A paper describes a structure:
Centromeres are microtubule attachment sites on chromosomes defined by the enrichment of histone variant CENP‐A‐containing nucleosomes. To preserve centromere identity, CENP‐A must be escorted to centromeres by a CENP‐A‐specific chaperone for deposition. Instead, fly‐specific CAL1 appears to combine the roles of both HJURP and the Mis18 complex: pre‐nucleosomal CENP‐A recognition and its targeting to the centromere for deposition, respectively (Phansalkar et al, 2012). In this study, we present the structural basis for the recognition of CENP‐A/H4 and CENP‐C by CAL1.
The structure of CENP‐C1264–1411 bound to CAL1841–979 was determined by molecular replacement using the CENP‐C1264–1411 structure reported here as a search model. CENP‐C binds CAL1 using a cradle‐shaped surface formed by loops L1, L2 and L3 and β‐strands β1 and β2. The calculated electrostatic surface properties show that CAL1 binding involves a surface suitable for both electrostatic and hydrophobic interactions. CAL1 residues 890–893, which form a β‐strand, interact with β1 of CENP‐C cupin domain running parallel to it and as a consequence extend the β sheet involved in cupin dimerisation. The CAL1 α helix consisting of residues 894–913 makes several hydrophobic (involving L896, I900, W904 and Y908) and electrostatic (R903 and K906) interactions with a complementary hydrophobic (involving residues Y1315, V1317, Y1322 and F1323) and acidic (S1295, E1311 and N1326) region of the cradle‐shaped CENP‐C surface. To evaluate the requirement of these interactions to stabilise CAL1–CENP‐C binding, we mutated conserved CENP‐C F1324 to Arg and CAL1 I900 to Arg and K907 and Y908 to Ala and tested the ability of these mutants to bind wild‐type CAL1 and CENP‐C, respectively, in separate SEC experiments. Both His‐CENP‐C1264–1411 F1324R and His‐SUMO‐CAL1841–979 I900R/K907A/Y908A failed to interact with His‐SUMO‐CAL1841–979 and His‐CENP‐C1264–1411, respectively, and hence eluted at their original elution volumes as compared with the elution volume of the CENP‐C–CAL1 complex. In the crystal structure presented here, the CAL1 binding site on CENP‐C is in close proximity to the cupin dimerisation interface: the loop L1 and β‐strands β1, β2 and β3 are all directly involved in stabilising the cupin dimer. Although CAL1 binding by CENP‐C involves just a cupin monomer, only one of the two cupin monomers was observed to interact with CAL1, while the equivalent CAL1 binding site of the dimeric counterpart was empty in the crystal structure. We speculate that the other binding site might be sterically hindered by the remaining residues of CAL1 not seen in the crystal structure, thus not allowing a second monomer of CAL1 to bind. Thus, the AUC together with the crystal structure shows that CENP‐C cupin dimer binds just one copy of CAL1 at any given time.
Residue numbers in the entry:
A (entry chain C): 1274 to 1296, 1304 to 1411
B (entry chain E): 890 to 913
C (entry chain D): 1274 to 1290, 1306 to 1411
D (entry chain A): 1274 to 1297, 1302 to 1410
E (entry chain B): 1274 to 1291, 1305 to 1411
């Protein structure tokens, strides 16, 4: 009950529900503050290399139009909800379409152009893992 | 007016509001 | 609500109760259950499933840095940095993360009487 | 004349006689407007908001205020006197005899890795120190 | 009065207007028409001052082996930076107390923006 309650209130916090967070090399979840950047909510763990692991919280059907994996390759893993991801290779003109549900993961190589859109009328949460 | 852990958070928030847009 | 129950069915699956979650096969090595996503570099994103109070032998981050994120439960992590003589002890709950630098020796133990699941991220 | 007035209003702000820091785009740029003073453990600290946190800042000391000896943990330090006078005691990782230094405005002392140092305001006025990590 | 009056004479000295490394040990030398004074540090030339004449310019240079911070001691400066991979130059105006961080690899130039002597402190990390 304790572990299931702590897991549930972390999810609701990441989804923007609750108002209460989950109370050196350790970056704990209660230290996760969400910042709005270009209209999308981002919360990153404190790591030696900054912003290497974080969460992207999307509003209903909110989309972030394509950007390029410039200096770091990234992995997108769905923490909650549903996402539509479009990927564009270096010289390729045709974009490939992917649907990601909770637990699904997509690897974005360096230089690949990618876009993310929340697929549902609820908040969906994505974990971004850069290397 | 602040604690050392409190300054760490205030500096942390101010750092993020300025530099996060360059790490996304 | 449909999305809540879908996430819960993923967690219970991980607790033992495009790379999709359905392509996650759990293989037991040295008594610990491992499930990794299919990535370009092998085994760089996966899950470690621990039995109640299960222990993971000390290992060294040799050719890689490491990140440990708790998917479920609680863990005891001991780290020994290079050159350092004293072990550092941390307890991690769900959502907590610890970074393991290259060369540091670390050990992991499930801290509670329930199955606990950890996400291992090699960057 | 214009630059003299801007220079004095920055100094007075660092010395604590001002209602607002010198008010100022590029993220590489940390303007004087980012010098907000926070009182921590009884001492006033102002840091520029920079890419690595807390690498350049100012320490405002009250009359004859002293900060007890501390150790240079993960980064080497440079202390350069912005205004006033300071007495600095330095103790390296070895030897029992501490070194005593007097720094007036413009003077700088280098504090190496691991060295333990203490700072005391030497006068009955506010003194300001610039810390460079 | 003594301390305020002492600080003013340091500024005038830096402006060209008439392990402790003190300010009296700051000797200025001119390289390519620009006046430089550096503190004696373990690593040479890690902390110093650049004195600029009215509208004087400093040729574009690269932070090669070292990251750099430029802090304006007096006056106003125009700094142009060219980032890694970037084609567009970034222009910044720095007044007294303002600082700019120049990363490794960045190419930068400095010009005194006004008709008076301007002084900047160069801080090497």
């Amino acid at each position: 009950d304790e572990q299931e309650e702590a897991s549930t209130k972390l999810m609701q916090w990441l989804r923007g529900v609750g108002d209460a967070p989950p109370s050196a090399s350790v970056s704990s979840a209660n230290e996760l503050i969400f910042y709005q950047v270009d209209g999308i909510d981002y919360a990153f763990y404190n790591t030696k290399e900054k912003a290497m692991l974080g969460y992207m919280r999307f509003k209903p059907y909110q989309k972030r139009s394509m950007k390029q994996a410039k200096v770091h390759p990234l992995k997108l893993l769905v923490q909650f909800g549903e996402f539509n991801v479009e990927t564009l290779a270096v010289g390729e003109e045709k974009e490939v379409h992917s649907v990601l549900r909770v637990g699904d993961m997509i690897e974005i190589d360096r230089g690949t152009r990618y876009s993310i859109q929340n697929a549902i009328d609820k908040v969906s949460v994505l974990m971004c893992i850069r290397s | 007016t602040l604690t050392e852990q409190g300054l760490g958070k205030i500096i942390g928030e101010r750092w993020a509001r300025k530099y996060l847009k360059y790490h996304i």
